[PDB]
């Protein structure tokens, strides 16, 4: 169900450039055009161009001819986007997609930005001081994203409500509710988990009464 | 260049429900052999497009029996002959006949469910955030329907609008919901100039605004 391997995410300066990885397997990478589609948040899917692996033949979108650059290696099986000059409006996911054959890889979030990766403050969320409970989990200050949030090691996936973090300044804040039982909490501890793999962040949270 | 037209952009349909999706190109869709090279494409949350229909009309392998695809020339359709919970996501067309390839806008499709309101809940500043000296405050408007909701905060009865920042989740596939956080962050000099911080949700579900709130004792 995916051909495709693609790195998760990226972080890039304004006016660098990255080189994104395509790593085809289990099929005849030589065989098919591979292409390349962007999406930024909010949608809306644009083509960029394509290229042909076993000749290396590109065709580009006008759109993107001044800004991408479309590559193979035939030996590795792999396959690249080069995108240069890198400004904000260069942040989104992107795509590569055998389309004669729908194979697609997970796309890559590109985040474009000055800011230092910054690690995140956790704080627990207690209720205040009738049948079922709610706890929360927040998360606050960090930089880029993403951020890797469970709870109770993703026991209680039932019941969970992590928010898409938002951005402000550079820094991302992060929200999850968890509800269970009344019966559940303080009974049973409920840890909320967050890794930040940017700035090897990786903490737990206990959630305790507060009084 | 070629421009494709997808409406409507958000589709509202019950399970069950048999929809349709319409794509207009601004061009003559034949390629250079006979065929016409339009596509659909969903795109379930969190992941990539999948291929549903290629070539207007023929099913793509492991696809489901209930959706199919018509048209010809200019305008195009894709219909859902039952929509079950599986079909939420966004909704392209495509068009290939022409370099580049250009995606419609998309269509969103929301399950249609009961109404249900707002469980609200609301958190004071954590002590930890305390002794840094910020003070957030969290308030989750959790599993309403419809959509359309507005947050409101309230600071010893006065409004308070600079400081929030809101999110939303998408439509849940288990339960057809919808949920929204807001956090409300000041200094800790602030925080403590105040006693009453409130939390008030309108939604359709109430003609009186569902509010939770505390005091700092
Ligand atoms: C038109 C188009 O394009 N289309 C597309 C394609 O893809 P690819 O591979 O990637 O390619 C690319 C290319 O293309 C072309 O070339 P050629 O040589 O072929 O002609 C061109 N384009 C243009 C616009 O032009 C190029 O460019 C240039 C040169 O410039 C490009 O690059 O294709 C594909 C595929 O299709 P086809 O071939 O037609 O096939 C299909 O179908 C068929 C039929 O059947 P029915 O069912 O209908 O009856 C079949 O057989 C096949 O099978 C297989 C698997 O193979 C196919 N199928 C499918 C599903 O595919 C396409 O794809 C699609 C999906 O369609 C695209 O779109």
Redesign the interface.
Known sequence: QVQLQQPGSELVRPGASVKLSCKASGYTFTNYWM?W?KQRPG?????I?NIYPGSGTT?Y???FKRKATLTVDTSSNTAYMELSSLTSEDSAVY?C?V?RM?Y????TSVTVSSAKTTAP?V??????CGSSV?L?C?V?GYFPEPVTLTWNSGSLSSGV?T????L?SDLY?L?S?V?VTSSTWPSQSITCNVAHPASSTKVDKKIEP?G | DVVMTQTPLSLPVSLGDQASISCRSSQSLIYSNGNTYLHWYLQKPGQSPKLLIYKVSNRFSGVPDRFSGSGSGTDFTLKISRVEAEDLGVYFCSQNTHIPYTFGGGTKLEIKRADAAPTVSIFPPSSEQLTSGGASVVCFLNNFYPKDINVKWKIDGSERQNGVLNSWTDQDSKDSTYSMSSTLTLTKDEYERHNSYTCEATHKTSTSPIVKSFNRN
């Open positions: 292409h589609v949608q809306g899917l644009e083509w161009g065709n979108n006008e759109k795509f997609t389309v729908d697609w890889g997970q796309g403050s704080y627990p969320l207690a209720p205040v709610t929360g927040l606050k409500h928010f898409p973090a938002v402000q804040t929200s509710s509800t507060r």
